[PDB]
Write a protein that binds this ligand. Structure first.
Ligand SMILES: [Mg+2]
Ligand SMILES: [Mg+2]
Ligand SMILES: [Mg+2]
Ligand SMILES: [Mg+2]
Ligand SMILES: [Mg+2]
Ligand SMILES: [Mg+2]
Ligand SMILES: [Mg+2]
Ligand SMILES: [Mg+2]
Ligand SMILES: [Mg+2]
Ligand SMILES: [Mg+2]
Ligand SMILES: [Mg+2]
Ligand SMILES: [Mg+2]
Ligand SMILES: [Mg+2]
Ligand SMILES: [Mg+2]
Ligand SMILES: [Mg+2]
Ligand SMILES: [Mg+2]
Ligand SMILES: [Mg+2]
Ligand SMILES: [Mg+2]
Ligand SMILES: [Mg+2]
Ligand SMILES: [Mg+2]
Ligand SMILES: [Mg+2]
Ligand SMILES: [Mg+2]
Ligand SMILES: [Mg+2]
Ligand SMILES: [Mg+2]
Ligand SMILES: [Mg+2]
Ligand SMILES: [Mg+2]
Ligand SMILES: [Mg+2]
Ligand SMILES: [Mg+2]
Ligand SMILES: [Mg+2]
Ligand SMILES: [Mg+2]
Ligand SMILES: [Zn+2]
Lengths: 80, 155, 60, 206, 24, 98, 127
RNA sequence: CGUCGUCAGCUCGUGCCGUGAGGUGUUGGGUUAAGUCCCGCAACGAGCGCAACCCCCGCCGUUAGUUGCCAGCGGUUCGGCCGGGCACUCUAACGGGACUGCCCGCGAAAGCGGGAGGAAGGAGGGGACGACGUCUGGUCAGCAUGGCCCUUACGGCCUGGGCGACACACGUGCUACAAUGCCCACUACAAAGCGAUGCCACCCGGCAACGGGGAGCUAAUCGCAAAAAGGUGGGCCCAGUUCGGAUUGGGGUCUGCAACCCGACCCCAUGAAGCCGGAAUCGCUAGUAAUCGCGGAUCAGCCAUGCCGCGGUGAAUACG
């Protein structure tokens, strides 16, 4: 029961910062604070280090995990 | 009621029979202030007595009430020790309230699925001298008298 | 309500969403009636004097 | 902590607002803040004058501002080279180019706000709080009046333990919505703390 | 009852509209 | 025919500001539509009496906007004289739509 | 010819016009049994007429706005009785003992603050 | 500001009593919602509080009428629509009305019981209003403020995270366990509010949320708007059910720079516990309780079932 409408949001910080790496090759991590941005196709393969408010955690983007956001892989809290 | 002796509310007469005793019974049936649904229920139950029975409903109604009226009841009281259920006569006013209440209470315990069906059958059984209503009434009088030993505590 | 926050007034919010009312008389950020721009507390005080015209004490 | 402002409580009857101008759900709040900005300087400046009150009317960029005082002369200035600098402040804030009257007060001993200011003053000069009050009530009660009362807050005399000093004469019926009782507060600042001062004056009933 | 979104009352109580409660 | 709604916070600041347009027109124009009331738009304000907690008190504040009508029958000329700048209200608003 | 009496109740006014004739009651146009479609109540609103043996003497045109049908019903009770007294003042001496003349003052108590409903006070834990 | 507590009290001046702290008055009898009033009295009066003066609701009258109405006539695309009219409703401003005034009874008086007249009767109903003081009450995080304390930082900017964590425990609520019920269709009665870069009629697209288009409204003359319970007809047939909607899968709309953490909403699917709740415990005395819906503040949107308020239907019981 998700939602957006029309314009699958992604933050330009990396959108371009990543589509450029494509123009060349793979890059050793890509740390960012835009856990908002939607994971789009041209990422599968890269390893984005998503922050969580304290840590810059590495995430290997796979096909199956496209439509999702970044934060969904960089969990915020720590539990018992 | 610490200051005055609360005067009994005076309710209008039954739209139909013009009997105040009936309006009362209706109010008791009523729940969530739906006097209509109430009034309705009662009346349909009055018709189910026209058929299944002979006499006019009012007669049965009156009789039904008159049978559920407990002329004695036990009321608890604290006296150096524990709670001694003391038997005492039941006033005219309370005699009625308890009757009408018990009718609806016994009535709604019945299995018939329709409200009106339940009231009518209870009034009938009541007027006959049977039914959960009359039961309780007897159950009370059983409690009373059966505790006459404490009767000398009056009120 | 430290001056450093009464800085908000500054137009440049970056995004129209980040803007908030704040009492114009005390800086109060919560319960800040629009019609007066005042906070619930301030409203009460001035109203009591007479600085709020037409504004009276409702009863019914 | 009980009892409401004797003024806010009488605004309907015996007591009118300090701002009597209309507006609408787009203006009011502005013309509002304005008055606050107004009295802002007025009370910061005309203190020595005897700032007993600052009324503010309107019509359309026009503003009454009938600032009342005990010593009008202190408002005017050298011949009038002040009530010229004050009218100056008017547009300095809001370029409405409005009036700015001045009205002496008929006996500043019936002007609760003052009566309280007086007491607040005395307290800062390290006066005897109780006497100051005994006296004040006297003056106020002396120059007419049907009743009066004064109340200084806590840390009286510099005390480590706050208290609340009294004094009151005649009638000062507050529950009677129709007494017409002037009320005035004064925040007497100090070296060891703050001291609230309140004054009430009962004059004429019906 | 007032808690079933997919009902007349469900829409009312939940202050809304849709299939189960259209604006006429 | 002269629509002229009056809106003040006082039911005399208008009832005066309208009592002018009442006779200062009768003395130069038709009997006029007389002054008409119109429901008042009330605005209440409910604040928690004291600061910090104690959410069970509040005390109520209302800012009621009264309304007036009038309507001078016949857009006269001599009526517009004594009704040109002989006003007296301070806290009123008057829209003219004859 | 015609006779009038207002009649109000629980915040609902009713216009009552009694004109000699049968008894056709036109509340908001519609027939009595039309506007009061199955409400054991209604009937009562005509009790003022029966109170004076009339009913079959006047036809009645009635208007009503405000409140609820039961309120409106009561209002009528007043109207029909009010107009009926105007028509004939000797009728007051008969409607008073039954009190159809009185205006039921019972209204809705204001919703007080702190409470849930004027009086219904919020419950509290182990006090 | 809360609270004892809207409780019926707390005092003062002078006189009088006592070495004195203090006492009297304020105690007493009668009466009242009340230190309310009456009678008595070494006290006589006064102040703060009670009451009244203010607001709302009941009835009536005047002034005004684009609200209303064939009341009454004419025309009617038969909509109070056009003309017309202030009658009625109403809108809102002023004024009347109730005083135990009157009648019987008891009484020393106050006042109590009862009666008529009257819309209303003995404080007619509901508000605002809360004494000297108490709790070292609550709040320096609204604001003000003495003192102390940090001043490359206990200050400032930002992005992100948190305030939304959960094995658990309690409070206040919401929805419900159903037939006096649930569902669909059709149809009828309200009050109080809100609306410009806002309320949005109406048209079309979409099951829809919503979208595109676009009339009117500075709003007693336009919109939010459907009031719901109710009435009428039909469905269900006692079952965890056509009761109940938790949870979860999926699709999508809208606000917003952005809805992973953490928005509401629509549609399909899923359809949980729950069969009326142990000990114990809460509210309410009349249009109150119960029950049904409507608006508003804050607010982009919203986690509101909360809060403040409005009207519909409308009880039971009080010996004591
Ligand atoms: Mg600060
Ligand atoms: Mg915001
Ligand atoms: Mg804010
Ligand atoms: Mg609160
Ligand atoms: Mg209600
Ligand atoms: Mg009292
Ligand atoms: Mg003495
Ligand atoms: Mg002695
Ligand atoms: Mg002596
Ligand atoms: Mg003494
Ligand atoms: Mg004592
Ligand atoms: Mg004594
Ligand atoms: Mg007494
Ligand atoms: Mg007294
Ligand atoms: Mg009249
Ligand atoms: Mg007497
Ligand atoms: Mg009072
Ligand atoms: Mg403490
Ligand atoms: Mg400090
Ligand atoms: Mg929290
Ligand atoms: Mg269902
Ligand atoms: Mg369509
Ligand atoms: Mg109109
Ligand atoms: Mg059926
Ligand atoms: Mg199942
Ligand atoms: Mg089911
Ligand atoms: Mg079952
Ligand atoms: Mg909102
Ligand atoms: Mg949520
Ligand atoms: Mg709501
Ligand atoms: Zn403030």
């Amino acid at each position: 029961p998700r939602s957006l409408k029309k314009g699958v949001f992604v933050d330009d910080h990396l959108l371009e910062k990543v589509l450029e790496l494509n123009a060349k090759g793979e890059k050793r991590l890509i740390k960012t604070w835009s856990r908002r941005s939607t994971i789009v196709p041209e990422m599968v393969g890269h390893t984005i280090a998503v922050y969580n408010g304290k840590q810059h955690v590495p995430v290997y983007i796979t096909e199956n995990m496209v439509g999702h956001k970044l934060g969904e892989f960089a969990p915020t809290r720590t539990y018992r | 009621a610490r200051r005055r002796r609360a005067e009994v509310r005076q309710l209008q007469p039954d739209l139909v029979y013009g009997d105040v005793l009936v309006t009362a019974f209706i109010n008791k049936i009523m729940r969530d202030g739906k006097k209509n649904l109430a009034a309705r229920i009662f009346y349909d139950a009055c018709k189910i007595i026209q058929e299944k029975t002979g006499q006019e409903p009012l007669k049965v109604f009156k009789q039904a009430v008159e049978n559920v009226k407990p002329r004695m009841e036990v009321r608890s009281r604290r006296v150096g020790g524990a709670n001694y259920q003391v038997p005492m006569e039941v006033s005219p006013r309370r005699q009625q309230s308890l009757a009408l209440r018990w009718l609806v209470q016994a009535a709604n315990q019945r299995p018939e699925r329709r409200a009106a069906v339940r009231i009518a059958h209870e009034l009938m059984d009541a007027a006959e001298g049977k039914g959960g209503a009359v039961k309780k009434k007897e159950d009370v009088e059983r409690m009373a008298e059966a505790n006459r030993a404490y009767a000398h505590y009056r009120w | 309500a430290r001056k450093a926050l009464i800085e908000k007034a500054k137009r440049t919010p970056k995004f129209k969403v980040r803007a908030y009312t704040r009492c114009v008389r005390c800086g109060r950020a919560r319960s800040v009636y629009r019609f007066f721009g005042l906070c619930r507390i301030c409203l009460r005080e001035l109203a009591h004097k007479g600085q709020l015209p037409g504004v009276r004490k409702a009863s019914w | 902590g009980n009892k409401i402002h004797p003024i806010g409580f009488r605004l309907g009857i015996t007591r009118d607002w300090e701002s009597r101008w209309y507006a609408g759900k787009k203006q009011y709040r502005h013309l509002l803040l304005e008055d606050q900005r107004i009295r802002g300087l007025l009370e910061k400046e005309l203190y020595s004058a005897g700032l007993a009150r600052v009324d503010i009317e309107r019509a359309a960029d026009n503003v009454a501002v009938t600032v009342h005082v005990a010593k009008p002369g202190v408002v005017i200035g050298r011949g009038g080279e002040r009530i010229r600098v004050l009218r100056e402040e008017l547009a300095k804030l809001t370029g409405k180019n409005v009036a700015l009257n001045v009205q002496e007060v008929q006996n500043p001993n019936l002007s609760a706000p003052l009566v309280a200011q007086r007491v607040a003053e005395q307290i800062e000069r390290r006066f005897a709080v109780r006497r100051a009050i005994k006296q004040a009530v006297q003056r106020v009660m002396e120059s007419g009046a049907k009743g009066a009362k004064v109340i200084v807050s806590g840390r009286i005399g510099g005390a480590e333990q706050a208290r609340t000093e009294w004094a009151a004469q005649g009638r000062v019926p507050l529950h009677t919505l129709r007494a017409n009782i002037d009320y005035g507060f004064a925040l007497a600042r100090t070296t060891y703390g703050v001291l609230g001062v309140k004054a009430y004056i009962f004059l004429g009933e019906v | 009852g007032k808690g079933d979104r997919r009902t007349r009352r469900g829409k009312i109580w939940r202050g809304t509209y849709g299939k189960y409660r259209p604006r006429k | 025919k002269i629509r002229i709604k009056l809106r003040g916070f006082d039911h005399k600041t208008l009832d005066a500001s309208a009592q002018k347009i009442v006779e200062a027109a009768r003395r130069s124009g038709a009997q006029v539509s007389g002054p008409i009331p119109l429901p008042t738009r009330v605005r209440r304000f409910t604040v928690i009496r004291g600061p910090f907690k104690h959410k069970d008190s509040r005390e109520h504040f209302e800012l009621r906007t009264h309304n007036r009508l009038v309507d001078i029958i016949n857009p006269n000329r001599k009526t517009i004289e004594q009704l040109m700048t002989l006003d007296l209200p301070t806290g009123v608003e008057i829209e003219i739509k004859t | 010819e015609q006779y009038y009496g207002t009649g109000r109740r629980k915040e609902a006014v009713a216009r009552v016009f009694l004109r000699p004739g049968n008894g056709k009651v036109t509340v908001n146009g519609q027939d009595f049994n039309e506007y009061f479609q199955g409400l054991v109540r209604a009937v009562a609103a005509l009790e003022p007429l029966r109170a004076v043996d009339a009913l079959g003497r006047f036809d009645a045109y009635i208007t009503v706005r405000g409140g609820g049908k039961s309120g409106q019903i009561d209002a009528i009770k007043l109207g029909i009785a009010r107009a009926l007294v105007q028509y004939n003042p000797d009728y007051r001496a008969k409607l008073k003992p039954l009190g159809f003349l009185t205006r039921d003052a019972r209204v809705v108590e204001r919703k007080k603050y702190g409470k849930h409903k004027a009086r219904r006070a919020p419950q509290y834990s182990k006090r």
